[PDB]
């Protein structure tokens, strides 16, 4: 802002016997060269506090309404096997399962290297671990292929 | 041959084949409307209205006057409430204005 | 057609150029150059040189009649001038600018071509209104 820019420290004009405002300074917000008092500064935390149980309840409710979206079919590591992670067979598998429209998520507990290799160049699709998905990342997928193992964890977390 | 027709509180002289604009009315275009409030048709006068007088009119269109933009403002007092309005009207003509 | 030739910013007072072209307004080729030649103004010579150049271009690049041409429209266009400064007494100087004029003269060869511009504007508004109307068909 105005006070954080170097420059002169004098009135650029005499005080009396003038025909203008006396002066603010050579460095003024109303003068060219910046100096706006208000704006972005590295002091704002940009964070808010929420209750843990509140987030658990929100996730439970969005999973409840997500489970009724009839796009929550089951998946298992078996089909994540029999593949090298190359997108070719992955592309065939997604196309056969009409997943081009969907941004489907794949919940997983172990994150096998083959699935990590696959889908790495498709911005439409995304994949992470079970305990790393947010509500925005959950409802934006429009579909999710669920794993048997994560059911126990989600039931425990309620 | 003439007729003094009252609409609202406005009186109008009309004859055969006369078109005029009056206040916005119901019974939209295409429908005949027979007003019984009309005086001074032909040399006969009733006190409130002419007796048995029936003037039948057909509406040509429903229109709007140009949007007057009215202001309220008193100098050196900082108030500038602004408002605009289009005045609905009905353009219509008479056919018979029978007795 | 026009037979114009822009001068591109000669330094002269625009008012004087406007005055001399008023002295030459309406006049034809036979009765303009003669009077323009011996009048005692320098801008007179300035406009005369360009008028002769424009006549030469009209004869060469257009091949018009060249014997019924007259000034259709004078202009005096103020080009970007320079900022010069001369000191003035008691420490209060001033900046003096040398006014520059952009000079061009259109040459017409008939009592018309002014209403034809109005016809062009009429065609412009006509195509505008039909385009608006043709759009209403889709509406």
């Amino acid at each position: 802002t105005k006070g954080e820019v170097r420059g002169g420290g004098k009135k650029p004009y005499k005080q009396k016997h003038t025909g203008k405002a006396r002066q603010g300074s050579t460095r003024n917000p109303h003068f060219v060269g910046g100096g706006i008092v208000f704006g972005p500064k590295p002091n704002r935390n940009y964070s808010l506090k929420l209750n843990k149980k509140a987030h658990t309840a929100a996730l439970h409710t969005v999973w409840s309404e997500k489970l009724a979206s009839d796009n929550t079919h089951l998946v298992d590591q078996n089909l994540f096997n029999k593949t090298e992670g190359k997108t070719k067979v992955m592309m065939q598998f997604l196309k056969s399962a009409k997943l081009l429209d969907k941004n489907v998520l794949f919940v997983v507990n172990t994150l096998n290297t083959n699935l990590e290799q696959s889908t790495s160049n498709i911005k439409n699709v995304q994949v992470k671990h079970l305990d790393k998905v947010s509500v925005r990342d959950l409802m934006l997928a429009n579909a999710l292929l669920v794993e048997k193992e994560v059911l126990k964890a989600l039931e425990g977390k309620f | 041959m003439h007729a003094i027709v009252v609409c609202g509180s406005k009186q109008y002289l009309v004859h055969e084949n006369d078109t005029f604009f009056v206040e916005k009315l119901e019974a939209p275009v295409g429908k005949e409307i027979q007003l019984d409030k009309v005086l001074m048709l032909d040399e006969k006068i009733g006190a409130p209205y002419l007796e048995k007088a029936r003037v039948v009119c057909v509406v040509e269109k429903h229109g709007l006057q140009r949007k007057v933009n009215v202001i309220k403002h008193i100098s050196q007092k900082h108030h500038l409430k602004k408002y605009g309005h289009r005045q609905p009207y009905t353009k219509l003509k008479v056919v018979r204005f029978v007795h | 057609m026009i037979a114009f030739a822009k001068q591109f910013r000669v330094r002269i007072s625009p008012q004087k150029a406007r005055l001399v072209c008023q002295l030459i307004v309406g006049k034809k080729t036979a009765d303009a150059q003669n009077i323009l030649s011996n009048t005692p103004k320098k801008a007179a010579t300035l406009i005369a040189k360009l008028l002769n150049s424009a006549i030469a271009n009209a004869t060469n690049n257009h091949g018009m009649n060249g014997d019924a041409l007259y000034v259709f429209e004078c202009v005096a266009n103020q080009g970007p001038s320079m900022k010069r400064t001369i000191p003035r007494a008691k420490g209060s100087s001033n900046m003096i600018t040398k006014r520059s004029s952009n000079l061009v003269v259109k040459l017409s060869d008939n009592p018309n071509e002014r209403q034809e511009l109005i016809k062009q504007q009429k065609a412009l508004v006509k195509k505008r209104v039909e385009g608006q109307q043709k759009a209403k068909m889709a509406r």
Binding site: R136, M139, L140 | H78, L80 | -
Partner: protein
Amino acid sequence: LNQLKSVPKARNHKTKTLGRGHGSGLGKTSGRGQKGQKARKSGLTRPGF
């Protein structure tokens, strides 16, 4: 709820833009009178004072 229509039930309140327009005043008036000591910069007093 989807990002195309994400709305809460209700949360909004009137804000004081002390130097914007004339709708709710909120301009030169600043909602603090005119030509007053409080209207000046840091126009106030010590809490106890």
